[PDB]
């Protein structure tokens, strides 16, 4: 194995691929990046088995086919720590990988790759090329309820529902749910799949910009992406977890549009010396006003008064205020329309440009 | 608070949503049984969200939802097993216990399995406001006496005949061990094709998942059976028994023998065997030993018992196994008398 | 305990001494912490920390005193035992100690006093050797024990001992009497039974200990003739068994005294009973027996898993065995 | 606070420390020569000279006159040695520490070589405390540590200290200090001190110093503290609870008289003053020993019960050997068993009781 | 009590002073800052029982006798959350110090100013002023050689002693010391002014070009520092500060004029496949060049070739690179001549360019 890359070329893959392998996750070899000069290519691959990130780097710069695997860090850092552009002459030289800088030699420890597992490519039941932005539109304005972990099974990844042209995400943790949907127009045989969280992240890391039109292939097993040289495959839990349809304010009646941010601020101020037990702020919300009794058990209250375009019955509805900033902010939205229930149900925080984008939290009183 | 016996748990369970169905009792068979019945009917009752979460001696507490309208992503009532501390909920616990009493315990349908609470806990405010909605299920075990009855009803759990001749022999030998006795009846039922208990059959293969109590030995000793008692101990060895136990239990009977020997040499045998205790069956063995065992010859015996006890317990001398051989004959004095140098 | 008057003169010297730096900054007060040492200690810190101001005061005024009264005196420490233990661990120690290597943190000397140094741990103590020996600036250390015996020697190598016996019996009784009603014989019987320490003497009349003392006393007078001791299981079977075990001993001993002709008893709270012991029992066996009362008292405390009762019982029978002839009658040795 | 003497009495040379010549010499000798171990084991009682021989050695290694039998007083390194700061030298109380943790760290720093010292010398004291692991970890560098690094082990006890450790030290067992060695050194000391010494007290202390010079020295400081100046007998006899009385024999006799009361009533009051039982005990015992000896030879004794020699004699001969052995024995066991009694006062009464029961 | 303040005005004071606040095992009101708007200044005490940052606010805002101590932050948070400029008025009433600035109000709690445990601050003799400019170097260069868990002296401390008109300071870890020399100062008495670990930080903070120049009354007692709207004052730990002249190598003299930076880089790289424990890089500075040979015990090796104008034969000394870089970087000087005594012995490094920052670390093993 032998290649020469530039530090920078390498650098994208130097992150993508390395990133979730640093942890030396799983097996060592797994926690090593596969170095593969195979051909003129130099693919990098960092499998974990939890997601995977491949970065490719085309390499015409000196290379001898072979392969090696090196820890995710050992290598990365050296290359990075190298000055830029650096022609990182990497050589499996036996079992030390001689990483040659320019007058600073380094010798990493390298096993030739000969193992290093790699994931299911499968013909992906639905495949499509994302316009990306939607991906973040959604991604950001729906990952506030996704649990990380969640014994409520697979909330720790998102609920990739394909339904028609719309791709919907749902995350929920059980008290707060978010749906944002947008449309892709990619006629996606509906399904819902829980893709590993770690996945989501890496994805988001390879969400990339430059409207990298993110190719997706959801399977059910595997799901595969293509954003540049960064091919990311995950296994999938398929499944689904609930959606907003039900969460839905029993009163849509009450409305409350107001500027996300005035509101956010209001929340933000509100949440000060507010309830330490549940972030319960009982907002008594006039038809115009919004008045947040946020007490905290330390006998400190915060009160913020501010207009709302409020409608429907002004009522104290509690909330985990904590929830509410989360989305406010993640929600790219100006006015957020609330459509409140009285506090039995959630209130409909929606995006204005809810492309079906419902962001719903249940009451939480103090 | 209403005390219920597990077998009658349906009365309160069913009739109404008891808040804290407090299976305080201790027979695991009874506790187990009182637990699953609430749960079963609870889970059926829309409390499928069922979680178990102990209450440490630790302050503990976690899910203290008891109404907050937080859900509608997963709305329902839930139910919460609390395994109690040793004596029951302590402070913090009690506190957050008293909170729940205060609220719909919504989504926190209380199932408090455990043991008997401590008094102060039971006077502690939490255990005061549960009342009238909760159910205490005494999950405490049969006396020797009620044991056959129970056992006999319990046979029909297995429906097999069992044999009451056998029941007794189970009631004695599994005097007080419902659970294992329940499993006892199970292993053998399987073991045969027929699985029908009856005493002859239960002799041929005996459940090696259910104990042959100290009694066999010690009682054998009562009699004065200074060899019988000895044999049961050969077995109590191969069986691996902790010596502590043997001592403990032996101590139990013998001190009972002293005291009863003080008053017995002038009070009809065995009445006292149950005016105190001394099983029915032992009572005879026991009324004898008072006559056999004259309190004096009896003294040196205690001195050796104590000796061994200490050998163990302070000293962790594991030669208490040999010290006993002395004692058997020191105490019994043989079925007769034959009291000798201590050891 | 409380500050009693008999803690003062100790203090003065010590602070004097301290003030003169003749008085070593170390200090050990034999006296029970039950006979007042704690307050005495703390009275010292009161001063000592506030830098020792005034000739000798407990300090009522002083910022040091008051901040130490608030305790917020950082200088100030109370340095009790550790609570994850109940003994004064090393760690506890490691801390306060090292805070003194940052000098005074709000002035006045520090006083870092152990509540009852009787209560220290070994990693703690070992730890404290060098600090009690070696003087950090402005440190006046103040330790308390039941008795000096509550501490290790190497420590005491460096302890500047300020003895402090129990105050005399009389006063210890008058002092004891003020506060517990029941005859001075019970005060004393108890006081005496306390190795004459008040602080120690006092406790007896609390609870049903001294009533149980009596209680016990009664059953026994029955026990003794009757050769049923077994009756006494309970009277002495208690959390204070050792104590009740103690109640008893001082009488047995009084009976042997009668066995050496000796009017003298340590339980002057009944001499009849005393006589009968000697009376029904040869001293040999009295003597033998006396041994064991304590021994159980020990064992009740020492044997892991030991049936308090089992032990209280065995003993009775065995006594009962002795009263009996033929049954060989010890004398204690080997 | 207020200063001590013990330390202040610690060597600069071998003399400051009384005894252990085997060690002094063993030391003077080691030092001078290339017989410098980077593993020393001073095993003696607390500041008998386990710590003293260490000091001499230290100054001598980091004698800036090399390694020298005596530590060539002044050397910077030598005089700072007994003062704070002194880079070469890093000293340690493994007492406060018990942890292994403490033990690990320690091994790491030996690397850094002074920017001016000449043996990075390490002095561990109170090593016993440290855990097993702490112990075993040291074996590694007792064998071959980096250069300059040393391992002056001083231990009170090398007992909570493995075989291998001893196996791997020069163990200069500092034997104990004769009462007299002590008395003397003290006598010398106290007198240097302005305050009138006090012979009685000197002895009172000499025996009382417990074979350790450090305490000896300690005692003293303390005696002054509570005698608020001046060593005087009485303040020290009393301070020491010591009965310079013949009550030992008084009671022995009153036991022998079968005299119960006198024996007992006396102890009780002694207990109000809490009077030391032991002191009292040792004495009785001794008398008995001698008396019997006086039987053996009322001369071949190396007896110091001369004031009462005649008494001794008198006793010795009139009481058969046997019984003398026996008295001696009774009370020896009782002393043994004295403490066991929950009043202290109680244990001694027993001892005597049993004697008094013997007669 | 009804004292107004200028939000902003107070805004920076609040932070300066809360940074030195609590940090003791006991830190109740140490968390609350006291304020009295004298009407003019205000107090804005943040005590630690070790250092203080009293800020004032210049403000003329009314006040009524409201001596209070309210949670530092809560109060703070509010001020900012309230508009700035905002004339932050408060009612001290029943230990409930409310804050009102517009539609936002809050009810904070208060801890009385009466039990406020404070510290020394006294008129501290001498007055001598160093610009924050160099003072900065001075602080940077030395402050990192703290070492802590001292049962022996102040490593983390640092001493202040004007040796001459200079000032010279020192903090050391015992394994590296840092002595920077600020020519400026006064000859004006030095005093046991051993400031801790913490203080030096805030001070350092009180310099940057900014604040006023830093002025000191070096008192043994306390000192009285003047920077920002604060008044920073320590009681000083009084006890010596270990030696600092001896520690200089034995003949630091080979001049290893390097660039601090390059070196700092190279050094950074070398450590990686250097010993992974102590970070004890071993050096064999090729004359005029450099050379470094690092090995991480755990395989690997790193090598550099750099330049140092170094005459005199290979320095052949290794030291803890972990220490080193720190000083390179606290060394604002980029020609750093090292004065080593080539041989596994201390190397003094100083700025080549001044002598201010002079720094010594010690070799590793022998």
Curated annotation (Swiss-Prot), chain B:
Record-listed E.C. numbers: 2.7.7.7
Keyword terms: DNA replication, DNA-directed DNA polymerase, Nucleotidyltransferase, Transferase
Gene Ontology BP term (one): DNA-templated DNA replication
GO cellular component term of the entry, any: replisome
InterPro entries assigned to the protein according to its UniProt record, in alphabetical order: DNA_pol3_clamp-load_cplx_C, DNA_pol3_delt_C, DNA_pol3_delta_N, DNA_polIII_delta, P-loop_NTPase
Protein family membership: Belongs to the DNA polymerase HolA subunit family.
Record-given protein name: DNA polymerase III subunit delta
Organism taxonomic ancestry: Bacteria, Pseudomonadati, Pseudomonadota, Gammaproteobacteria, Enterobacterales
Gene designation: holA
Curated annotation (Swiss-Prot), chain C:
A single GO molecular function term of this UniProt record: DNA-directed DNA polymerase activity
Keyword Transferase: yes
Catalysed reactions listed for this entry: DNA(n) + a 2'-deoxyribonucleoside 5'-triphosphate = DNA(n+1) + diphosphate
EC number(s) per entry: 2.7.7.7
GO annotation terms (biological process): DNA replication; DNA-templated DNA replication
Matches recorded under SUPFAM superfamilies: P-loop containing nucleoside triphosphate hydrolases (SSF52540), post-AAA+ oligomerization domain-like (SSF48019)
Assembly and binders: The DNA polymerase III holoenzyme complex contains at least 10 different subunits organized into 3 functionally essential subassemblies: the Pol III core, the beta sliding clamp processivity factor and the clamp-loading complex. The Pol III core (subunits alpha, epsilon and theta) contains the polymerase and the 3'-5' exonuclease proofreading activities. The polymerase is tethered to the template via the dimeric beta sliding clamp processivity factor.
Purpose of the protein: Part of the beta sliding clamp loading complex, which hydrolyzes ATP to load the beta clamp onto primed DNA to form the DNA replication pre-initiation complex. DNA polymerase III is a complex, multichain enzyme responsible for most of the replicative synthesis in bacteria. This DNA polymerase also exhibits 3' to 5' exonuclease activity. The gamma complex (gamma(3),delta,delta') is thought to load beta dimers onto DNA by binding ATP which alters the complex's conformation so it can bind beta sliding clamp dimers and open them at one interface.
The protein, known as: DNA polymerase III subunit delta'
Organism name: Escherichia coli (strain K12)
UniProtKB/Swiss-Prot annotation, chain D:
One term under GO cellular component: DNA polymerase III, clamp loader complex
Record EC number: 2.7.7.7
Effect of residue 117 to D: In dnaX2016(Ts); present in both isoforms, unable to grow at 42 degrees Celsius
Catalysed reactions, semicolon-separated: DNA(n) + a 2'-deoxyribonucleoside 5'-triphosphate = DNA(n+1) + diphosphate
Positions contributing to ATP binding: 44-51
Molecular function GO labels: ATP binding; ATP hydrolysis activity; DNA binding; DNA clamp loader activity; DNA polymerase processivity factor activity; DNA-directed DNA polymerase activity; identical protein binding; metal ion binding
Domain of life of the native organism: Bacteria
Binding residues annotated for Zn(2+), in chain numbering: 63, 72, 75, 78
Claim: Lipid metabolism is one of the keywords in the record: no
GO biological process: DNA replication; DNA-templated DNA replication; viral translational frameshifting
Keywords carried by this UniProt record: ATP-binding, DNA replication, DNA-directed DNA polymerase, Metal-binding, Nucleotide-binding, Nucleotidyltransferase, Transferase, Zinc
Subunit organization: The DNA polymerase III holoenzyme complex contains at least 10 different subunits organized into 3 functionally essential subassemblies: the Pol III core, the beta sliding clamp processivity factor and the clamp-loading complex. The Pol III core (subunits alpha, epsilon and theta) contains the polymerase and the 3'-5' exonuclease proofreading activities. The polymerase is tethered to the template via the dimeric beta sliding clamp processivity factor.
Purpose: Part of the beta sliding clamp loading complex, which hydrolyzes ATP to load the beta clamp onto primed DNA to form the DNA replication pre-initiation complex. DNA polymerase III is a complex, multichain enzyme responsible for most of the replicative synthesis in bacteria. This DNA polymerase also exhibits 3'-5' exonuclease activity. The gamma complex (gamma(3),delta,delta') is thought to load beta dimers onto DNA by binding ATP which alters the complex's conformation so it can bind beta sliding clamp dimers and open them at one interface.
Residues of the full protein shown: 2 to 360 of 643
């Amino acid at each position: 194995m032998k290649f020469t890359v530039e530090r920078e070329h390498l650098l994208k893959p130097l992150q993508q691929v390395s990133g979730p392998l640093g942890g030396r996750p799983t097996l060592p070899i797994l926690g090593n990046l596969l170095l593969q000069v195979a051909d003129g290519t130099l693919s990098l691959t960092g499998t974990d088995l939890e997601m995977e990130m491949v970065a490719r780097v085309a390499l015409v710069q000196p290379h001898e086919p072979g392969a090696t695997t090196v820890p995710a860090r050992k290598f990365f850092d050296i290359c990075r720590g190298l000055p830029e552009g650096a022609e990182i002459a990497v050589q499996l030289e036996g079992e030390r990988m001689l990483v040659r800088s320019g007058r600073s030699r380094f010798s990493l420890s390298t096993l030739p790759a000969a193992d290093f597992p790699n994931l299911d490519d499968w013909q992906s039941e639905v495949e499509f090329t994302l316009p990306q932005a939607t991906m973040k539109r959604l991604i950001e304005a729906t990952q506030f309820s996704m649990a990380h972990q969640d014994v409520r099974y697979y909330l720790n990844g998102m609920l990739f529902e394909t339904e028609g042209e719309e791709l919907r995400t749902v995350a929920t943790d059980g008290h707060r749910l978010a749906v944002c949907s947008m449309p892709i127009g990619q006629s996606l045989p509906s399904h819902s799949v829980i893709v590993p969280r770690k996945g989501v992240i890496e994805l988001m890391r390879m969400l990339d910009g430059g409207d990298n039109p993110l190719r997706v292939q959801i399977g059910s097993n595997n799901i595969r992406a293509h954003v540049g040289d960064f091919i990311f495959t995950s296994k999938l839990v398929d499944g689904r977890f609930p959606d907003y349809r039900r969460v839905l304010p029993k009163n849509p009646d009450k409305h409350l549009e107001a500027g996300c941010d005035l509101l956010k601020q209001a929340f933000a101020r509100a949440a000060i010396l507010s309830n330490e037990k549940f972030r319960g702020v009982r907002l008594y919300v006039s038809e115009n006003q919004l008045k947040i009794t946020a007490n905290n058990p330390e006998q400190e209250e915060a009160e913020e008064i501010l207009d709302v375009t409020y409608s429907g019955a002004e009522m104290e509805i509690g909330f985990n205020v904590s929830y509410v900033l989360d989305v406010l902010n993640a929600l790219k939205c100006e006015n957020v329309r609330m459509m409140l229930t009285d506090s039995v149900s959630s209130v409909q925080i929606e995006d204005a440009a809810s492309q079906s984008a419902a962001y719903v939290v249940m009451p939480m009183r103090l | 608070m209403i005390r219920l016996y597990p077998e009658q748990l349906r009365a309160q369970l069913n009739e109404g949503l008891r808040a804290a169905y407090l299976l305080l009792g201790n027979d695991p068979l009874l506790l187990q049984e009182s637990q699953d019945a609430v749960r079963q009917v609870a889970a059926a009752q829309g409390f499928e969200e069922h979680h178990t979460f102990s209450i440490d001696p630790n302050t503990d507490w976690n899910a203290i939802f008891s109404l907050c309208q937080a859900m509608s992503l997963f709305a329902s009532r839930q139910t919460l097993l609390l395994l109690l501390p040793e004596n029951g909920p302590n402070a913090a616990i009690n506190e957050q216990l008293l909170t729940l009493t205060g609220l719909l315990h919504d989504d926190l349908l209380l199932i408090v399995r455990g043991n008997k609470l401590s008094k102060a806990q039971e006077n502690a405010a939490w255990f005061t406001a549960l009342a009238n909605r909760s159910v205490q299920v005494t999950c405490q075990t049969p006396e020797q006496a009620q044991l056959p009855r129970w056992v006999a009803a319990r046979a029909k759990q297995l429906n097999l005949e069992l044999d009451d001749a056998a029941n007794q022999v189970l009631c004695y030998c599994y005097e007080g061990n419902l659970l294992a006795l329940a499993q006892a009846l199970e292993r053998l039922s399987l073991l045969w094709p027929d699985g029908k208990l009856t005493l002859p059959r239960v002799e041929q293969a005996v459940n090696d998942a259910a104990h042959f109590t100290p009694f066999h030995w010690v009682d054998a000793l009562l009699m004065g059976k200074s060899k019988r008692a000895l044999h049961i101990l050969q077995q109590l060895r191969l069986e691996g028994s902790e010596p502590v136990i043997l001592l403990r239990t032996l101590q139990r009977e013998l001190l009972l023998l002293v005291n009863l020997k003080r008053q017995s040499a002038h009070t009809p045998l065995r009445a006292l065997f149950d005016k105190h205790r001394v099983w029915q069956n032992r009572r005879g063995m026991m009324g004898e030993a008072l006559n056999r065992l004259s309190q004096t010859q009896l003294r040196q015996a205690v001195q050796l018992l104590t000796r061994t006890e200490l050998t163990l317990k302070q000293d962790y001398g594991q030669s208490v196994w040999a010290e006993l051989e002395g004692l058997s004959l020191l105490l019994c004095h043989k079925p007769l008398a034959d009291v000798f140098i201590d050891g | 305990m409380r500050w009693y008057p008999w803690l003062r003169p100790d203090f003065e010297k010590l602070v004097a001494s301290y003030q003169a730096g003749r008085g070593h900054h170390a200090l050990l007060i034999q006296a029970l912490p039950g006979m007042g040492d704690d307050a005495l200690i703390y009275a010292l810190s009161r001063y000592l920390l506030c830098q020792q101001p005034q000739g000798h005061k407990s300090c009522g005024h002083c910022r040091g005193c008051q901040l130490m009264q608030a305790g917020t005196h950082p200088d100030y420490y109370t340095l009790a035992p550790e609570k994850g233990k109940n003994t004064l661990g090393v760690d506890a120690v490691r801390e306060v100690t090292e805070k003194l290597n940052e000098h005074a943190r709000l002035g006045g000397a520090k006083v870092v006093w152990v509540t009852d140094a009787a209560l220290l741990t070994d990693a703690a103590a070992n730890a404290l050797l060098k600090t009690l020996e070696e003087p950090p600036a402005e440190t006046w250390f103040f330790l308390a024990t039941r008795e000096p015996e509550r501490l290790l020697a190497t420590l005491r190598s460096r302890c500047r001992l300020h003895y402090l016996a129990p105050p005399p019996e009389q006063y210890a009784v008058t002092w004891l009497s003020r506060e517990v009603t029941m005859s001075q014989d019970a005060l004393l019987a108890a006081l005496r039974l306390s190795a004459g320490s008040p602080g120690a003497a006092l406790a007896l009349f609390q609870g049903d200990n001294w009533q149980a003392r009596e209680t016990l006393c009664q059953a026994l007078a029955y026990s003794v003739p009757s050769g049923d001791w077994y009756s006494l299981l309970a009277a002495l079977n208690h959390e204070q068994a050792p104590a009740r075990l103690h109640w008893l001993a001082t009488l047995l001993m009084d009976a042997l005294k009668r066995h050496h002709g000796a009017a003298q008893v340590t339980n002057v709270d009944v001499p009849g009973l005393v006589a009968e012991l000697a009376n029904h029992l040869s001293p040999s066996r009295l003597q033998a027996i006396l041994g064991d009362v304590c021994h159980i008292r020990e064992q009740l405390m020492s044997v892991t898993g030991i049936n308090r009762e089992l032990l209280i019982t065995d003993l009775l029978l065995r006594i009962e065995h002795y009263l009996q002839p033929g049954v060989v009658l010890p004398v204690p040795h080997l | 606070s207020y200063q001590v003497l013990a330390r202040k009495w610690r060597p600069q040379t071998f003399a400051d420390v009384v005894g252990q010549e085997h060690v002094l010499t063993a030391l003077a000798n080691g030092l001078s020569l290339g017989r410098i171990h980077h593993a020393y084991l001073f095993s003696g009682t607390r500041g008998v000279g386990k710590t003293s021989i260490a000091r001499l050695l230290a100054k001598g290694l980091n004698c800036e006159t090399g390694i020298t039998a005596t530590p060539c007083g002044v050397c910077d390194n030598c005089r700072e040695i007994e003062q704070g700061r002194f880079v070469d030298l890093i000293e340690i109380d493994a007492a406060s520490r018990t942890k292994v943790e403490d033990t690990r760290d320690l091994l790491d720093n030996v690397q850094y070589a002074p920017a001016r010292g000449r043996f990075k010398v390490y002095l561990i004291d109170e090593v016993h405390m440290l855990s097993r692991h702490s112990f075993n970890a040291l074996l590694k560098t007792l064998e071959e540590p980096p250069e300059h690094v040393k391992f002056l082990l001083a231990t009170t006890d090398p007992q909570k200290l493995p075989v291998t450790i001893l196996s791997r030290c020069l163990q200069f067992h500092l034997k104990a200090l004769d009462v007299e060695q002590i008395r003397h050194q003290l006598e010398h000391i106290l007198n240097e001190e302005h305050i009138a010494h006090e012979p009685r007290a000197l002895q009172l202390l000499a025996r009382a110093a417990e074979g350790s010079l450090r305490d000896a020295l300690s005692l003293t400081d303390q005696a002054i503290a509570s005698g608020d100046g001046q060593v005087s007998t009485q303040a020290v006899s009393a301070m020491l609870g010591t009965l310079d009385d013949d009550q030992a024999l008084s009671l022995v006799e009153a036991m022998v008289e079968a005299n119960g009361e006198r024996v007992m009533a006396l102890i009780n009051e002694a207990a109000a003053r809490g009077i030391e039982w032991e002191a009292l005990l040792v004495e009785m015992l001794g008398l008995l020993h001698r008396i019997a000896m006086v039987q053996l030879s009322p001369a071949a004794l190396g007896n110091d019960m001369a004031a009462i020699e005649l008494r001794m004699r008198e006793l010795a001969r009139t009481i058969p050997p046997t019984d003398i052995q026996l008295y001696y024995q009774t009370l020896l066991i009782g002393r043994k068993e004295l403490p066991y009694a929950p009043d202290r006062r109680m244990g001694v009464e027993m001892t005597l009781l049993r004697a008094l029961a013997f007669h």
